[PDB]
Amino acid sequence: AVFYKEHKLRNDGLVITTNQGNIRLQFKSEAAIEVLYRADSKQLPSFALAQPESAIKAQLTETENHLQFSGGTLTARIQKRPFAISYYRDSELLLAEESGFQKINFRFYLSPGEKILGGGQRILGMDRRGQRFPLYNRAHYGYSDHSGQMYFGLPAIMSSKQYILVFDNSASGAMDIGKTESDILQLEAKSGRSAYILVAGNSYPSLIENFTQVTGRQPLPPRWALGSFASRFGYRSEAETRATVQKYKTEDFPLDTIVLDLYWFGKDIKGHMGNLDWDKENFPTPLDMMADFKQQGVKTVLITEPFVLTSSKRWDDAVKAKALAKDPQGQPKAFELYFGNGGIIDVFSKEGSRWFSSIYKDLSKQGVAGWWGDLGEPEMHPEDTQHAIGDADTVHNAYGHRWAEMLYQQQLDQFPELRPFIMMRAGFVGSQRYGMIPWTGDVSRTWGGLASQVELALQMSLLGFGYIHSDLGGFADGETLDKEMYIRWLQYGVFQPVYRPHGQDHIPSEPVFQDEETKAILRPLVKLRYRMLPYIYTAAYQNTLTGMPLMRPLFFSDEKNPALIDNKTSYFWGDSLLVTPITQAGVESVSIPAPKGVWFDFWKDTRYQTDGAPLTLPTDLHTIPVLVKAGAFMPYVPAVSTTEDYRSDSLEIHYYADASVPLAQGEIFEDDGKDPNSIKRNQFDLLTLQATHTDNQLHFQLARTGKGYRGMPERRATTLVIHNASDQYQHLDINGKTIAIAQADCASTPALACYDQERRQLQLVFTWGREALNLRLHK
Ligand SMILES: *[C@H]1[C@H](O)[C@@H](O)[C@H](O)[C@@H](CO)[C@@H]1NCCCCCCCCN=[N+]=N
């Protein structure tokens, strides 16, 4: 039995007293509220919130039976007797407490028909209603087509009613999404903070904008993060690492970054972890290695882990520095891991953080450009391990999150003019604000492992992680390459956030070590990835601005059709491309549930119109099915080997014209690819294109804003290819000057405007300078 007794309003927050204790309510924005039960008691702070101490002005009104506490769009309605809080957007019920709060336990009602995404990485179906699962980050080695518990859980859900609910608790716990009781959402933890956060929105984009506003926005990664990575588990030597960089050159595959797994610090998988320094028998001249790679535009990333083994060179020093978590007796805690016997660096302590940070600083000074943190669940984390702020079970799901924060802060302190690259396997809600780029762990080399990746990506993307990706080609076990699976996985790779093939080294993960057929297929696609950098990097910019994920689910296309929520086989890559990965062997055709409208075959230019019915496309081995939305501007630059050579002096833009799209817009974001302050300081060149398409005219308005950046081209040579262009356009005006449109020999003359009747493509070639440009095509 819980009932209201009294309330006070202090520092814009509502403090309610019930018979059971105090509850603190603070609006973190107009659309988001933090509800803290046991507010009078000492407890761990928020991990989810970017500004945990903010509380914006709200209005409180009181009635006989209720209080209402209201920000601009979200309202909390507090029923006095019995005590229960419910949440409204406008006049619409989002979520109501059932018994609410009662070791730690929250119970809410679910509405009939309500669909619930969430929980982070699980392979259960996109709608997790009907499922129960733990909140305890944990390895799932070799997973394929099913998982209730893996590396990176999130204590959060997204509802078809367009709210996001976060359980802001770091402890070992559980989520029961109407499994045990069909109309009850239950959140449980053994200990930790007794708080939740509700975020509302008017659309899925806005919801995500509102969520990332209070949990954190990902800073723009360095543009090289969008390039080709060489990786395996693991390069065994400097000579082998150099030979791999060389293989990319001699095989003509793009390469930005080479990744070094655990052999960089010892010759065996076991026994060396914690050395955190070069194994000189196998990496004899590592400074030269990294410098030599830098001359070829290639970055070096090194693996690190939380654990320091008692067999490692740094055990005695870690103990001396008090860097390791302790037992209740106060000695360093040691325990068995896969890798051997050892302790865990206490990233929650001053001592642990300074010690680990110093090691990162030193290696970064030597030439390391980015960082890979593996095993941050932490993979093994015995219950009686004590960290500075609590025991293992209490802090477990935030260890990785704090590890990212530590490393992020460290990298910014060392290199304030560079964007940190931090790739980790486990985090918390908000970890994206520390630049965390997650990957979906040790996936099996099976079709099932591939077939799960869109589900996993969308689930993480929706709740803050735009750069979620997979080990391309698969990671775990296998005895010989499954060639078709590998090709499909690396094709899909082009259209997902990070291009990082990676696997256990008994089978090659890198595309340069594949057979002639496989390379003939993948080489033009890895180059396509580079040619498409302006499209991808523009989506990255939008992710930084608004949280908008790079991969978007099919359900964004129609928010009034909740059945689309179940789709985990077709997704949007940026605004304009609907991608359907092939995820089983021998598939001869696919049925693509394209939204109502006009669509083009990305590869073949075929125009399709549909009023709802799916489109059936044949498959081939050299592509996966990709449709372009009518009204898309697809921007390309010439392929380079490394993003260090990126230029946009030459632009090629493809516009997909159709009379059904009378107004279309596109943008291309350009900056120096490296300055972490480029967006804040307007040191960029934002190119905008607008098409106006009427019965007798097609008009393009081109412009640039922003303050520019060093090396920005003043004038770009631009080729605009208009697909599905009318054969009736007779003239072009460029800023009022009339130019005839040639109707022959478009590929064989230096034509300024030419219509190719066989391809229905109208090509315009012009100089795009700093002033506004209008191109008018007239029948
Ligand atoms: C962490 C990370 O997820 C991977 O991408 C890394 O490459 C590795 C190595 O640093 C790490 N996971 C290691 C898993 C090792 C298990 C090896 C088992 C051998 C086969 N046994 N069976 N069955």
What does the DSSP assignment read for 154-203?
Answer: EEEEEETTSEEEEE---SSEEEEESSSSTTEEEEEESSS--EEEEEE-SS
Cα–Cα distances in Å, from 435 out to 153, 431, 658?
A: 18, 7, 39
Residues 177 and 224 occupy one common structural domain: no
Give me the residue label for tokens 């990957």.
439
CA distance 282 to 278: 8
Residues 155 and 121 occupy one common structural domain: yes
CA distance 744 to 721: 15
Residues 475 and 608 occupy one common structural domain: no
CA of 424 to the centre of ligand 1 (A): 14
Which of these is catalytic: 97, 209, 256, 442? 442
CA distance 586 to 241: 35
Structural domain that includes position 739: 631-779
Which of these is catalytic: 238, 374, 575, 671? 374
Q: Is the dihedral of CA 449, 450, 456, 457 positive or negative?
A: positive
Tell me the one-letter amino acid at 681. Answer: R
Token pair listed for 685: 């060149």
CA distance 579 to 497: 13
Residue 279 marked in a binding site: no
CA of 373 to the centre of ligand 1 (A): 13
CA of 457 to the centre of ligand 1 (A): 21
Specify whether 30 is catalytic: no
Residue 510 marked in a binding site: no
Atom 21, ligand 1: residue with shortest CA distance: 477
Q: Extract the runs of DSSP E, i.e. beta strands, from 214-269.
A: 229-230, 257-260
- Contact partners, residue 514, CB within 8 Å, separation at least 6: 481, 483, 486, 508, 522
Atom 13, ligand 1: residue with shortest CA distance: 442
- Contact partners, residue 64, CB within 8 Å, separation at least 6: none
Residues 405 and 554 occupy one common structural domain: yes
Mutate to test the pocket of ligand 1, among 259, 303, 424 (most ligand atoms within 8 A of CB): 303
Specify whether 188 is catalytic: no
CA nearest to 160, candidates 202, 116, 200, 198: 116
Mutate to test the pocket of ligand 1, among 144, 263, 374 (most ligand atoms within 8 A of CB): 374
- The CATH number of residue 328's host domain is 3.20.20.80
Under a CB-based contact definition with an 8 Å cutoff, are residues 231 and 510 in contact? yes
- The CATH number of residue 738's host domain is 2.60.40.1180
Specify whether 559 is catalytic: no
Token pair listed for 52: 């945990």
Phi-psi category of 271—alpha, beta or left, where left has phi over 0 and alpha has psi -120 to 50?
Answer: left
CA distance 175 to 191: 14
Which of these is catalytic: 377, 482, 575, 685? 377
Domain boundary residue among 167, 197, 227?
197
Residues within a 6 A CB radius of ligand 1: 233, 261-262, 303, 374-375, 425, 441-442, 477, 502
Residues 24, 27, 31, 37, Cα dihedral to 10°? -10
- Tell me: cis bond preceding 614? Omega within 30 of 0 counts: no
Q: Is the dihedral of CA 311, 369, 223, 405 positive or negative?
A: positive
Residue 90 marked in a binding site: no
Resolution (A): 2.0
Q: How far apart are the first and last CA of the chain?
A: 76
Q: Which atom of ligand 1 is nearest to the CA of 471?
A: 5
Phi, psi at residue 553, to the nearest 5°? -70, 160
Under a CB-based contact definition with an 8 Å cutoff, are residues 335 and 297 in contact? no
- Contact partners, residue 572, CB within 8 Å, separation at least 6: 551, 552, 553, 554, 556, 557, 578, 579
Residues 491 and 594 occupy one common structural domain: no
Residue 649 marked in a binding site: no
Residues 475 and 559 occupy one common structural domain: yes
CA distance 254 to 298: 10
Q: Which atom of ligand 1 is nearest to the CA of 425?
A: 3
CA of 440 to the centre of ligand 1 (A): 13
Residues 670 and 725 occupy one common structural domain: yes
Distance of CA 709 to the CA centre of its chain: 26
Taking the CB of residue 749, how many other CB atoms lie within 10 A of it? Answer: 10
Residue 505 marked in a binding site: no
CA of 475 to the centre of ligand 1 (A): 8
Residues 395 and 247 occupy one common structural domain: yes
Domain boundary residue among 159, 174, 197?
197
Q: State the method.
A: X-ray
Token pair listed for 764: 């315009």
CA of 751 to the centre of ligand 1 (A): 56
Tell me the one-letter amino acid at 234. Answer: G
Domain boundary residue among 147, 164, 197?
197
Residues 418 and 519 occupy one common structural domain: yes
Give the three-class secondary structure for 80: coil
Residues 417 and 485 occupy one common structural domain: yes
Question: Sheet harboring 737-740: ordered strands across?
Answer: 663-670, 685-693, 697-705, 773-778, 731-734, 737-740
Per the structure, the count of domains in the chain is: 4
Residues 11 and 34 occupy one common structural domain: yes
Residues 113 and 193 occupy one common structural domain: yes
Beta partners for residue 325, in sequence order: none
CA distance 199 to 375: 31
Q: Which atom of ligand 1 is nearest to the CA of 261?
A: 10
